[PDB]
């Protein structure tokens, strides 16, 4: 009932459509990182944000219900 | 001709991707489970829960990325996005490990959905539902290792993390703390898995080498038709070969294929039972008789006592970095070590 | 006009595309092209790889620190290196690479020509170059020509060793040097005595050859046996016992050679792993046994300088901490390296006496170059990760090193194994095709149905 | 020990000769189809 | 945490003057250390004599002191035992022994300064990991 | 009609209850020798000084082992790769102290198992079968060669061969992980894929055929009785099984050529175990698993641990404790 893929991906209309959409997604994912937006969405430390300058303690969550406030505290300690 | 029967009509249409009523559960939960793993291994850290980098973004590779378990302090929290810990904050949720319970719970319901799909398709096509029955074993493994085991321990932290090297760590933790290779239930599982691999290889090789010459080409794959009535290989010649090489052989084609179902499914089920015990630290750790003799006789040594020394090394050397919430400080002088090393 | 117009399809040949090169079994002209073009690839790789190695070569690093496997082969033959394996001239490396690379164009040309332009079969064009696999005289004749080429190749090694500069001798007085071989060993009791030697520890079969005179003289015998055998095979035809023993077909001949090459690859794997004469440790790095002995030596030296009497220091188990006895009494290094006492090397043999290691020589005669050499080899042991992190599995990143010996041993064990699989596959197929049942059991004449029951 | 050694050497040689002369004794012909393979 | 100029400021001599290396000088030193020294000194230890490490405290108590750039550069030129009592260029790489340790040949004085600064900066970053051995991996 | 021809006909007879054949002429005595020695040694052998340090390990049942802890202990590290037959010992007591039985057992076993593989080719020729069942068996056989022969060769001693016992096997696996990081080696990972995949495909094939059996029995009897040995017709509906499996995934992930299916079943586990055996055989020459220890560092240069560094901690605990009295110098180079 559905049209074979081999005719779709050898057709001109497919390549016209997808020579646009495929680079647009690939470029958008690239900028998601290079603008640094990825770090702030997910909360991942940038290479200079694992430790404060002189400490070697890990900022480990130790409380169940105050965990949100503990992480915020540790982010503040990056001055 | 109510809406229910119309909706049933549409769900069960013969399309490229069968949907079924089962699909309503299977497809979202499986998609979210896989999508969460890919999202987490690409972008999300394990720094606040484990003291670890675990994403492509941090510099990990395919072998070392993981979605890691939540912090020990979370207990066995469901860790809902809207729960009291993350409080709606998607970013905190990721940093607190919420993607772990997200993948675990959506994966579990996804697995239920795949099994229901097996029943649903079997019922429409008109076959016995043994494929679904065989699939109970993967579910038993997943439920016992990823859910039951941490529920018996202090928290989700000690469950497996979803990653390649993270699972390797889980293997080694189980040797050192649980002496899991000594567990008769693991041994039965090993036999089921290896015996299944053996059966798969021997049956496939036997068929491919007792084929009937139903064509003239040197490639024998073309001399088979899906609607032929005759068997494509000789059971009689296969039985004589194995009877004379090995002493015994299959003679019943139905028993042979039931046995190919039975061996690995039973093995996985046996291993699930041992892991339930380990949820309680109900280990096969020691042989008491060996310990009494070794305590009293410093010349008695076996491969059993030798392996305990290695477990003791595993525990002391991995615990501080592996359980950072414990704040183990083991001065060098207390670390067990042999001579020189 | 038609996609199926040629004989290069399943319909014409019976073979699917994934066995496509089996379509060549009876097309001697295209088959000749396949072989000659493949010989070009081999020659191409030898040439391009050498130029890569030379382009990446820093001469004041040891070769084995730089990932080289071809330049060490050239250096071993006496080109580009002086006393102690120092590199004095990189130009001979350049030449080997260039000449191989240029010649690969000649071979690729003839290969492509014979594969896609020239006569597809040869038997009408020439009774000489044409052949029928079932023609045992023609087959032994081609085998005879190739034996002769191989013997000439063995003798080229002799000529380089005896008349064109010599070979690098790791054992030569003064830390090793290029040396001309003027008295190659010819006594068959020495040469064929290697062949009858046990392959287990302390004996080592032919991997134990430890001087260049035996190596050179070994190739004098091989070259003569080969030219005599090629002549025998051009002038004779197989006897009846041989005729009744073998399967005479193209696939069968292939399977015999696969078995032969499998065995040779297993032998090369041990050669490079154990032997430090024709694989000098200066070029390839220390062997496993060597690096292990060198650690014992390193710490015997350090502790004796601090005042330890190493000969009488009792270790924790009761065995000597530095020195102990082997099961036949020889004084040997202590610790786990007790397993490696069969090791011999130029940097260690001066301390050796009739009873093994000499405590007097250990106390007085250890030179600084031995200390230097044992420290270098202990820190370049053949251990490393797949991503080339040197050291034991638990080491941290820093040192980018995997020994050439590990690269050469592992690659050639892997190849030797798959080539034994290939031997079993083609050998079994050749037998089944000759007897007529390689495509399956004929339904109307199933042999098992005419056999009595077992019970 | 020297008697044991001779015994094993003789036994091993016996069985290897059987293997070699067995496969030299027209083995390709010992199949259920084409029995003429020289 | 960043690699800051304070981190990169190390003792120039025993008198107490200090030099400040550049980020690229440190990274060049790390590379030359790997090239020339790491085979024995990976992570700050000494595989052929584990009693001597490259910890700053150990270097401080060497004779003469080696916990500064000039002491380390001099060591790399004319190495001695820990008590100053004996010259060991014949068994330890040095410019003085670059004929038997050929990897030292292409090294210049500025290269030695790079290696030295790396040896002195790395324990400021790693702590006990430097010179600590497998216990701290 | 002469004696040798009548013997050749008996040896290669397709009428013997168990086929002998020319490979069986070598196989039968060597497997008997290996079997009898193994049974006697597992029950009654005195302790063996495995690591060459006069510290004998007890392997046998009479000397305080059970089924799980018992082993035939590898031969002494003082022997290395030397050949140690009975007649090279001054006495049986010497031979037992130093682990002689282990060598006799594995050498005879490897010989006998190689002939077992040849015997699989040979009988298939006498029966008119296609020849490649022995090829599938080369995957477990090459695995035995790896742990009993190749790995000792690369490490310099049969004392690092795999012990012949259950708990001894575990000691082999733990020490191997400490010294080679086998879990991080792609060839062991391919091997896991083979055996995990083989067990999956085993159950898959078993469950599909079983669930498309054609009704030939009542509900009070075993469905197995619906198949008769030697019947010409196939006993299950492969089109029905394909219709199920195709709809389960998509139509084109489901075989309908039975010969493609069974070749796939043979191929997946055999290829994976080939790589498992090649992992062991190449880690015998110390080309080890991937080393990502301290691969990730931050802007200052702090080490940021990954899961790879946690594995390394466990490896260290194994490394420092194994053979606790056998190392005098800081690096365990073999
Ligand atoms: C068809 C018929 C063919 C014949 C079959 C008949 C069976 C005969 C038995 C063969 C098996 C040998 C087992 C032991 C192999 C071994 O301990 O190998 C080691 C020896 C080398 O011996 C070593 O050789 C060394 C020689 O070096 C010496 O000399 C050197 C000179 O530079 C150095 O100085 C060095 O330091 C010094 O020690 C030392 O003597 C060592 O102590 C000694 O162990 O290798 C060698 O003999 C090279 C040959 C061995 C190849 C090994 C192949 C393994 C096969 C496995 C295949 C798997 C198949 C799976 C199927 C599915
Ligand atoms: C469709 C299948 C499906 C299933 C089974 C699940 C299941 C789950 N999701 Mg997932 N999810 C899905 C699709 C699904 N999800 C989709 C499509 C998205 C994208 C939007 C998500 C995005 C998502 C996020 C972001 C999160 C989850 C979470 C969860 C978990 C908690 C759910 C919960 O507590 O809700 C409870 C809600 C219900 C049970 C609703 C039913 C209410 C019924 C209809 C009321 C009946 C009343 C009766 C009829 C009449 C009473 C009237 C009376 C007044 C008289 C659970 C494992 C959480 C999680 O995983 O934490 C780790 C979480 O944070 N999901
Ligand atoms: C070393 C690798 C190698 C070599 C030397 C060959 C050689 C050959 N193959 Mg085989 N084959 C191979 C690998 C190889 N194959 C692999 C990996 C597969 C699986 C994909 C096959 C599957 C296969 C099938 C199914 C068939 C062959 C056939 C052939 C023969 C005829 C090819 C032909 O007419 O093409 C014509 C091709 C062209 C006209 C296109 C261009 C080809 C040229 C040679 C490219 C060379 C480029 C090179 C840079 C030029 C250098 C010039 C320089 C020296 C100046 C030929 C002797 C055929 C045969 O048996 O005929 C009876 C056949 O049907 N092969
Ligand atoms: C004899 C074979 C051989 C050996 C022992 C070596 C050894 C080496 N090479 Mg060389 N090389 C070779 C062939 C070989 N090479 C070939 C054929 C090429 C052309 C591609 C090269 C081109 C090359 C370059 C450009 C470079 C090297 C380099 C090196 C060094 C580092 C290797 C490394 O990091 O690999 C990493 C390991 C792998 C990639 C292994 C991956 C796993 C393989 C692919 C599995 C193979 C499976 C099997 C063959 C197939 C089975 C199929 C099954 C279905 C039956 C090392 C000394 C480097 C060097 O240091 O130069 C000085 C370097 O820069 N090599
Ligand atoms: C070794 C493999 C090999 C074999 C068996 C053949 C055989 C043949 N070739 Mg082919 N060919 C080859 C390689 C080979 N060639 C190579 C390498 C090239 C590229 C140069 C060619 C290019 C080629 C062309 C263009 C033609 C042939 C032709 C022929 C046919 C007649 C040749 C003749 O009688 O010359 C007579 C003999 C000589 C001239 C002796 C020359 C000896 C050379 C120059 C030196 C030998 C020394 C030493 C052995 C070489 C070592 C090289 C090695 C180290 C790499 C004959 C079937 C002809 C044909 O197809 O007829 C229809 C034809 O036109 N060949
Ligand atoms: C590539 C090299 C090669 C190949 C493929 C052949 C192939 C052949 N030769 Mg030729 N031969 C060669 C080189 C070669 N030869 C050389 C260099 C010489 C000079 C010495 C000879 C001298 C020669 C003679 C005098 C005869 C042959 C014969 C034959 C045919 C019978 C083969 C046979 O029965 O072997 C199988 C080997 C045996 C049956 C003997 C027993 C082998 C023992 C059991 C193996 C022990 C090896 C051991 C495991 C490992 C090696 C170490 C060991 C030395 C200690 C066959 C076509 C025969 C023939 O028909 O001539 C026309 C024949 O009478 N050859
Ligand atoms: C002196 C003393 C005491 C010595 C003791 C030494 C010692 C250490 C003993 C160890 C004790 C020991 C055995 C421990 C093992 C214990 C262990 C772990 C047991 C597991 C038991 C258990 C319940 C496991 C649960 C999982 C399970 C059911 C596993 C079963 C595994 C199994 C039997 C797999 C089958 C493997 C096998 C060889 C199959 C052969 C089948 C065969 C003949 C195929 C031939 C064939 C193929 C075809 O394709 C066709 C067409 C035909 C026609 C045909 O025929
Ligand atoms: C093995 C062949 C080595 C190489 C390569 C390098 N070093 Fe070394 N180092 C080695 C030893 C055996 C010793 C102690 C020698 C003794 O008897 O005292 C050393 C010592 C040093 C020291 C002294 C450390 C101390 O605490 O006093 C320094 C500062 C040092 N080495 C530096 C150094 C550098 C910079 C290297 C690369 C150019 C280097 N070493 C290489 C062994 C080896
Ligand atoms: C989480 C979450 C979510 C979701 C999300 C999603 C859904 C996602 C998805 C995602 C995705 C979906 C992604 C994907 C990715 C992919 C990738 C990243 C891939 C890669 C690949 C590759 C790299 C490949 C490779 C290869 C192989 C594997 C083999 C063959 C060959 C080759 C080489 C090609 C939501 C919102 C709901 C909620 C919140 C949370
Ligand atoms: C048949 C066939 C095939 C194959 C083919 C082949 C295999 C071929 C080969 C070929 C070859 C084998 C080629 C070669 C070539 C070479 C060349 C062409 C070279 C050149 C060189 C040069 C140019 C050089 C240069 C230089 C110098 C001199 C100096 C230094 C630098 C340089 C480098 C620059 C195939 C499979 C595809 C398919 C189809 C069929
Ligand atoms: C160079 C050199 C040398 C020398 C060498 C030599 C001298 C060698 C030789 C070698 C040889 C001299 C070899 C031989 C071999 C042989 C073989 C390899 C055989 C085989 C066989 C077979 C394979 C057979 C089989 C069979 C049987 C048994 C039965 C019947 C059937 C058949 C035929 C199959 C030396 C070391 C001094 C030093 C270094 C260098
Ligand atoms: C949960 C929903 C169960 C079906 S409920 C059912 O649905 C019919 C239409 O299909 C109606 O006609 C009927 O009145 C209604 O009760
Ligand atoms: O012996 Mn069994 O284990 Ca192969 O490393 Mn070295 O040696 Mn012993 O130590 Mn670790
Ligand atoms: Ca055609
Ligand atoms: Cl040691």
Swiss-Prot record, chain B:
GO terms for biological process: photosynthetic electron transport in photosystem II. Disulfide bonds: none annotated. Chlorophyll a PD2 binds at residue 186. The chain crosses the membrane at residues 29-49, 113-129, 141-154, 196-216, 267-283. This is Photosystem II D2 protein. Residues 1-28, 130-140, 217-266 are cytoplasmic. CDD domains: Photosystem-II_D2 (cd09288). Fe cation binds at residues 203, 257. GO terms for cellular component: photosystem II; plasma membrane-derived thylakoid membrane. It is found in: Cellular thylakoid membrane. Belongs to the reaction center PufL/M/PsbA/D family. The D1/D2 heterodimer binds P680, chlorophylls that are the primary electron donor of PSII, and subsequent electron acceptors. It shares a non-heme iron and each subunit binds pheophytin, quinone, additional chlorophylls, carotenoids and lipids. There is also a Cl(-1) ion associated with D1 and D2, which is required for oxygen evolution. The PSII complex binds additional chlorophylls, carotenoids and specific lipids. Residues 50-112, 155-195, 284-341 are lumenal. The keyword rRNA processing does not apply. Chlorophyll a ChlzD2 binds at residue 106. The gene is psbD. One of its GO terms (molecular function) is oxygen evolving activity. PSII is composed of 1 copy each of membrane proteins PsbA, PsbB, PsbC, PsbD, PsbE, PsbF, PsbH, PsbI, PsbJ, PsbK, PsbL, PsbM, PsbT, PsbX, PsbY, PsbZ, Psb30/Ycf12, peripheral proteins PsbO, CyanoQ (PsbQ), PsbU, PsbV and a large number of cofactors. It forms dimeric complexes. The keyword Hydrolase does not apply. 2 of the reaction center chlorophylls (ChlD1 and ChlD2) are entirely coordinated by water. Pheophytin a binds at residues 118, 131. It comes from Thermostichus vulcanus (Synechococcus vulcanus).
From Swiss-Prot, chain C:
Keywords: Chlorophyll, Chromophore, Manganese, Membrane, Metal-binding, Photosynthesis, Photosystem II, Thylakoid, Transmembrane, Transmembrane helix. Binds multiple chlorophylls and provides some of the ligands for the Ca-4Mn-5O cluster of the oxygen-evolving complex. It may also provide a ligand for a Cl- that is required for oxygen evolution. PSII binds additional chlorophylls, carotenoids and specific lipids. Chlorophyll a 12 binds at residue 229. Chlorophyll a 8 binds at residue 96. Residues 5-50, 138-159, 258-272, 454-455 are cytoplasmic. Chlorophyll a 7 binds at residue 408. Disulfide bonds: none annotated. Gene3D superfamilies: photosystem ii from thermosynechococcus elongatus (1.10.10.670). InterPro entries: PS_antenna-like (IPR000932), PS_II_antenna-like_sf (IPR036001), PSII_PsbC (IPR005869), PSII_PsbC_sf (IPR044900). This is Photosystem II CP43 reaction center protein. It comes from Thermostichus vulcanus.
Swiss-Prot record, chain D:
It is a single-pass membrane protein. The keyword Thylakoid applies. The modification Blocked amino end (Met) is found at residue 1. Residues 1-7 are lumenal. This is Photosystem II reaction center protein I. PSII binds multiple chlorophylls, carotenoids and specific lipids. It comes from the Bacteria. Residues 25-38 are cytoplasmic. Keywords: Membrane, Photosynthesis, Photosystem II, Reaction center, Thylakoid, Transmembrane, Transmembrane helix. It holds the Pfam family PsbI. Belongs to the PsbI family. GO terms for cellular component: photosystem II reaction center; plasma membrane-derived thylakoid membrane. GO terms for biological process: photosynthesis. It is found in: Cellular thylakoid membrane. The keyword Transport does not apply. Its main location: membrane. The chain crosses the membrane at residues 8-24. It comes from Thermostichus vulcanus (Synechococcus vulcanus). PSII is composed of 1 copy each of membrane proteins PsbA, PsbB, PsbC, PsbD, PsbE, PsbF, PsbH, PsbI, PsbJ, PsbK, PsbL, PsbM, PsbT, PsbX, PsbY, PsbZ, Psb30/Ycf12, peripheral proteins PsbO, CyanoQ (PsbQ), PsbU, PsbV and a large number of cofactors. It forms dimeric complexes. One of the components of the core complex of photosystem II (PSII), required for its stability and/or assembly. PSII is a light-driven water:plastoquinone oxidoreductase that uses light energy to abstract electrons from H(2)O, generating O(2) and a proton gradient subsequently used for ATP formation. It consists of a core antenna complex that captures photons, and an electron transfer chain that converts photonic excitation into a charge separation.
Swiss-Prot record, chain F:
Signal peptide: none annotated. One of its GO terms (cellular component) is photosystem II. InterPro entries: D1/D2, Photo_II_D1/D2_sf, Photo_RC_L/M, Photo_RC_L/M_CS, PSII_D1. Chlorophyll a ChlzD1 binds at residue 108. Its EC number is 1.10.3.9. Keywords: Calcium, Chlorophyll, Chromophore, Electron transport, Herbicide resistance, Iron, Magnesium, Manganese, Membrane, Metal-binding, Oxidoreductase, Photosynthesis, Photosystem II, Thylakoid, Transmembrane, Transmembrane helix, Transport. The record marks 180 as: Stabilizes free radical intermediate. GO terms for molecular function: chlorophyll binding; electron transporter, transferring electrons within the cyclic electron transport pathway of photosynthesis activity; iron ion binding; oxidoreductase activity, acting on diphenols and related substances as donors, oxygen as acceptor; oxygen evolving activity. The record marks 151 as: Tyrosine radical intermediate. The D1/D2 heterodimer binds P680, chlorophylls that are the primary electron donor of PSII, and subsequent electron acceptors. It shares a non-heme iron and each subunit binds pheophytin, quinone, additional chlorophylls, carotenoids and lipids. D1 provides most of the ligands for the Mn4-Ca-O5 cluster of the oxygen-evolving complex (OEC). There is also a Cl(-1) ion associated with D1 and D2, which is required for oxygen evolution. The PSII complex binds additional chlorophylls, carotenoids and specific lipids. Pfam families: Photo_RC. It catalyses: 2 a plastoquinone + 4 hnu + 2 H2O = 2 a plastoquinol + O2. The chain crosses the membrane at residues 19-36, 108-123, 132-146, 187-208, 264-278. A quinone binds at residues 205, 254-255.
């Amino acid at each position: 009932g559905e049209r074979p893929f081999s005719d779709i991906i050898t057709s001109v209309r497919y390549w016209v459509i997808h020579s646009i959409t495929i680079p647009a997604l690939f470029i958008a994912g690239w900028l998601f990182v290079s603008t640094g937006l990825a770090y702030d969405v997910f909360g991942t430390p940038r290479p200079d944000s694992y430790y404060a300058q002189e400490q070697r303690s890990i900022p480990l969550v130790t409380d169940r219900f105050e965990a949100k406030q503990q992480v915020e505290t540790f982010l503040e300690q990056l001055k | 001709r109510g809406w229910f029967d119309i909706l049933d009509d549409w769900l069960k249409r013969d399309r490229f991707v069968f949907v079924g009523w089962s699909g309503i559960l299977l497809f979202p939960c499986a998609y979210l489970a896989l999508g969460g793993w890919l999202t987490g291994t690409t972008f999300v850290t394990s720094w606040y829960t484990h003291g670890l980098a675990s994403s492509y973004l941090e510099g990990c590779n395919f072998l070392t990325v993981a979605v890691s378990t939540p912090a020990n302090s979370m207990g066995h929290s469901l860790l809902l996005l809207w729960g009291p810990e993350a409080q709606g904050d998607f970013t905190r949720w990721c940093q607190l490990g919420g993607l772990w319970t997200f993948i675990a719970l959506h994966g579990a319901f996804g697995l239920i959905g795949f099994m229901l799909r097996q029943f649903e398709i079997a019922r429409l096509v008109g076959v016995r539902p043994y494929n679904a029955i065989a699939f109970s074993a993967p579910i038993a493994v997943f439920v016992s290792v990823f859910l039951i085991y941490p529920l018996g321990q202090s928290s989700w932290f000690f469950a497996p993390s979803f990653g390649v090297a993270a699972i390797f760590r889980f293997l080694l933790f189980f040797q050192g703390f649980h002496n899991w290779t000594l567990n008769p239930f693991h041994m039965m599982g090993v036999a089921g898995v290896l015996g299944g691999a053996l059966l798969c290889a021997i049956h496939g090789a036997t068929v491919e080498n007792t084929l009937f010459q139903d064509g003239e080409g040197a490639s024998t794959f073309r001399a088979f038709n899906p609607t032929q009535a005759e068997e494509t290989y000789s059971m009689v010649t296969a039985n004589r070969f194995w009877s004379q090489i090995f002493g015994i052989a299959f003679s019943n084609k139905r028993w042979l294929h039931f046995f190919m179902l039975f061996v690995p499914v039973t093995g996985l089920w046996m291993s699930a039972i041992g892991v339930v015990g380990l949820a309680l630290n109900l280990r096969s750790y020691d042989f008491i008789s060996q310990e009494i003799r070794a305590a009293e006789d410093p010349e008695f040594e076996t491969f059993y006592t030798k392996n305990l020394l290695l477990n003791e090394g595993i525990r002391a050397w991995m615990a501080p970095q592996d359980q950072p919430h414990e704040n183990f400080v083991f001065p060098e002088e207390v670390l067990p070590r042999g001579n020189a090393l | 006009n038609s996609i199926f117009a040629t004989n290069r399809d399943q319909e014409s040949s019976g073979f699917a595309w994934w066995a496509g090169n089996a379509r060549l079994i009876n097309l001697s002209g295209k088959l000749l092209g396949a072989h000659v073009a493949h010989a070009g690839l081999i020659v191409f790789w030898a040439g391009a790889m050498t130029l890569f190695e030379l382009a990446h070569f820093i001469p004041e690093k040891p070769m084995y620190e730089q990932g080289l496997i071809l330049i060490p082969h050239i250096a071993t033959l006496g080109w580009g290196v002086g006393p102690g394996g120092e590199v004095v001239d990189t130009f001979p490396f350049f030449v080997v690479g260039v000449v191989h690379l240029i010649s690969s164009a000649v071979l690729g040309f003839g290969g492509v020509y014979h594969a896609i332009r020239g006569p597809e079969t040869l038997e009408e064009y020439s009774s000489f170059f044409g052949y029928d696999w079932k023609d045992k005289n023609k087959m032994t004749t081609i085998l005879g020509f190739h034996l002769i080429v191989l013997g000439i190749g063995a003798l080229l090694l002799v000529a380089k060793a005896m008349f064109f500069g010599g070979l690098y001798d790791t054992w030569a007085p003064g830390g090793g040097d290029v040396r001309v071989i003027t008295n190659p060993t010819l006594d068959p009791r020495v040469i064929f005595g290697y062949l009858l030697k046990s392959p287990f520890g302390g004996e080592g079969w032919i991997v134990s050859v430890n001087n260049l005179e035996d190596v050179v003289g070994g190739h004098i015998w091989i070259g003569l046996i080969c030219i005599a055998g090629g002549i025998w095979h051009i002038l004779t035809t197989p006897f009846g016992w041989a005729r009744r023993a073998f399967i005479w077909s193209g696939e069968a001949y292939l399977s015999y050679s696969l078995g032969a090459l499998s065995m040779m690859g297993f032998i090369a794997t041990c050669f490079v792993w154990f032997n430090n004469t024709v694989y000098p440790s200066e070029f390839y790095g220390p062997t496993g046994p060597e690096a292990s002995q060198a650690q014992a030596m390193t710490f015997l030296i350090r502790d004796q300088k601090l005042g330890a009497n190493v000969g009488s220091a009792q270790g924790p188990t009761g065995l000597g901490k530095y020195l102990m006895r082997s099961p036949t009494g020889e004084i040997i290094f202590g610790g786990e390296t007790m397993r490696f006492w069969d090791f011999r090397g130029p940097w260690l043999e001066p301390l050796r006496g009739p009873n093994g290691l000499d405590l007097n020589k250990i106390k007085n005669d250890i030179q600084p170059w031995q200390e230097r050499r044992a420290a270098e080899y202990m820190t370049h042991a053949p251990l490393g990760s797949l991503n080339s992190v040197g050291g034991v599995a638990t080491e941290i990143n820093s040192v980018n090193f995997v020994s050439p010996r590990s690269w050469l041993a592992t690659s050639h064990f892997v190849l030797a194994f798959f080539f034994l699989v290939g031997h079993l596959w083609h050998a079994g197929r050749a037998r089944a095709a000759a007897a007529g049942f390689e495509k399956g059991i004929d339904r109307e004449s199933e042999p098992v149905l005419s056999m009595p029951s077992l019970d | 020990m020297e008697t044991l050694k001779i015994t094993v050497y003789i036994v091993v040689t016996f069985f290897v000769l059987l293997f070699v002369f067995g496969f030299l004794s027209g083995d390709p012909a010992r199949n259920p189809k084409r029995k003429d393979l020289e | 945490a960043e690699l800051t100029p304070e981190v990169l400021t190390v003792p120039l001599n025993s008198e107490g003057k200090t030099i400040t290396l550049t980020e690229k000088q440190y990274l060049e030193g790390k590379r030359l250390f790997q090239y020339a020294c790491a085979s024995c000194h990976v992570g700050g230890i000494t595989k052929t004599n584990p009693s001597l490490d490259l910890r700053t405290e150990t270097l401080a108590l060497a004779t003469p002191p080696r916990d500064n750039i000039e002491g380390l550069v001099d060591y790399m030129k004319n190495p001695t035992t820990y008590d100053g009592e004996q010259e060991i260029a014949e068994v330890h790489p040095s410019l003085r022994s670059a004929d038997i340790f050929p990897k030292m040949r292409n090294l210049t004085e500025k290269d030695l300064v790079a290696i030295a600064g790396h040896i002195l900066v790395e324990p400021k970053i790693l702590g006990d990991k430097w010179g600590g051995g497998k216990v701290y991996y | 009609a002469n004696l040798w021809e009548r013997f050749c006909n008996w040896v290669t007879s397709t009428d013997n209850r168990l086929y002998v054949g020319w490979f069986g002429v070598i196989m039968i005595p060597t497997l008997l020798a290996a079997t009898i020695c193994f049974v006697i040694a597992f029950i009654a052998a005195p302790p063996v000084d495995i690591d060459g340090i006069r510290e004998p390990v007890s392997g046998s049942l009479l000397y305080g082992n059970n089924i799980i802890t018992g082993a035939v202990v590898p031969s002494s590290n003082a022997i290395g790769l030397h050949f140690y037959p009975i007649w090279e010992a001054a006495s049986l007591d010497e031979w037992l102290y130093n682990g002689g039985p282990y060598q006799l057992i594995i050498f005879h076993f490897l010989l006998g198992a190689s002939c077992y593989m040849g015997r699989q080719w040979e009988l298939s020729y006498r029966l008119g079968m296609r020849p490649w069942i022995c090829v599938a068996y080369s995957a477990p056989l090459a695995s035995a060669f790896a742990v009993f022969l190749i790995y000792p060769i690369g490490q310099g001693s049969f004392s690092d061969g795999m012990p012949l016992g259950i708990s001894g096997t575990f000691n082999f696996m733990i020490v191997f992980q400490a010294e080679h990081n086998i879990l991080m080696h792609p060839f062991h990972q391919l091997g896991v894929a083979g055996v995990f995949g083989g067990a999956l495909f085993c159950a898959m094939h078993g469950s599909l055929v079983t669930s498309s059996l054609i009704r030939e029995t009542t509900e009070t009897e075993s469905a197995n009785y619906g198949y008769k040995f030697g019947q010409e017709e196939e006993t299950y509906n492969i089109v029905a099984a394909h219709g199920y499996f195709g709809r389960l995934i998509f139509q084109y992930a489901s075989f309908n050529n039975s010969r493609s299916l069974h070749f796939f079943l043979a191929a997946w586990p055999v290829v994976g175990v080939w790589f498992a055996a090649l992992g062991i055989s190449t880690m015998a020459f110390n080309l080890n698993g991937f080393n990502f220890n301290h691969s990730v560092i931050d802007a200052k240069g702090n080490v940021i641990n990954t899961w790879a560094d946690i594995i390394n901690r466990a490896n260290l605990g194994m490394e420092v404790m194994h053979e606790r009295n056998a190392h005098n110098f800081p690096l365990d180079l073999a």
